[PDB]
Amino acid sequence: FKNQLLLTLSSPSEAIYVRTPVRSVTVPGSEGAMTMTNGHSQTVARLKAGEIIVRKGETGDEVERFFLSDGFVLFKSPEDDSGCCTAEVLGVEVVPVSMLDKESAATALQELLQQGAGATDEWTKARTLLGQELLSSVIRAAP
């Protein structure tokens, strides 16, 4: 086909891309953010939160932002006959940034801190901390 990057960005409830040809795609790995392009090595990574940023070949400058909660990324080298290199970004809940809110975000953060103030269980403390992480990411990412 072409020497592009075939992205598929998918959640269970909606597949946003299937074989979209793009140039570069940034993704928030569990260690830190990183950007996949054509030629990138075969790799697997776990994601933590934040704003995937897609950049089509037709766009170049224009972008598309999507918020991801958690999931995985799988970059597969290009088949010899396809001429094109593929990537799969799986997310348990993938929203756009247009559909996000900072007020309900901060309210949920407040209620999470309220629930976790009675820190007794390990899972409750951990859930409070991880909710703090994700909600801070939502706040920093929303417009």
Partner 1 sequence: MWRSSGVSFTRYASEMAALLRQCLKEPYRTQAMQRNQIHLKETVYQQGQVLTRETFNDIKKAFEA
Partner 2 sequence: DLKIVAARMKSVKSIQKITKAMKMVAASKLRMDQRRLENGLPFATPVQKLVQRIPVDPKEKGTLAVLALSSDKGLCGGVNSFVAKQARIVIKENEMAGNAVQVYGVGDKIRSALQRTFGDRFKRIMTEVTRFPWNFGQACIIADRLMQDNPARLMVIYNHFKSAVAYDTLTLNVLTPTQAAQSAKEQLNTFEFEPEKTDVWKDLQDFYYACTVFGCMLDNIASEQSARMSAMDNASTNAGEMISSLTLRYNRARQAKITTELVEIISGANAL
35 binding partner 2? (CB under 8 A): no
Number of residues that bind partner 2 (CB under 8 A): 21
Residue 139, CA distances (Å) to 16, 63, 77, 107, 126 in order: 23, 20, 35, 11, 20
Q: Which of 84, 90, 100, 130: binder of partner 2 (CB under 8 A)?
A: 90
* Total residue count of the chain as it appears in this document: 143
How far is residue 92's CA from residue 23's CA, in Å, rounded to a whole number? 24
Neighbours of 56 (CB within 10 A): 19
Site for partner 1 in 75-134 (CB under 8 A): 92-93, 95, 99-101, 104-105, 108, 112, 122-123, 126-127, 129-131, 134
- Nearest alpha-carbon partner for 1 in 57, 81, 87, 86: 81
- Segment lying near partner 1 (by CB under 8 A), choices 15-23, 52-60, 65-73, 82-90: 65-73
Q: Half-sphere exposure of 126 toward its Cβ, with a 13 Å CA cutoff?
A: 3
How far is residue 123's CA from residue 55's CA, in Å, rounded to a whole number? 38
95 binding partner 2? (CB under 8 A): no
45 binding partner 2? (CB under 8 A): yes
Q: Which residues bind partner 2 (CB under 8 A)?
A: 8, 10-15, 18, 29-31, 41-46, 72, 74, 88, 90
Q: Which residues bind partner 1 (CB under 8 A)?
A: 13, 69-71, 92-93, 95, 99-101, 104-105, 108, 112, 122-123, 126-127, 129-131, 134-135, 138
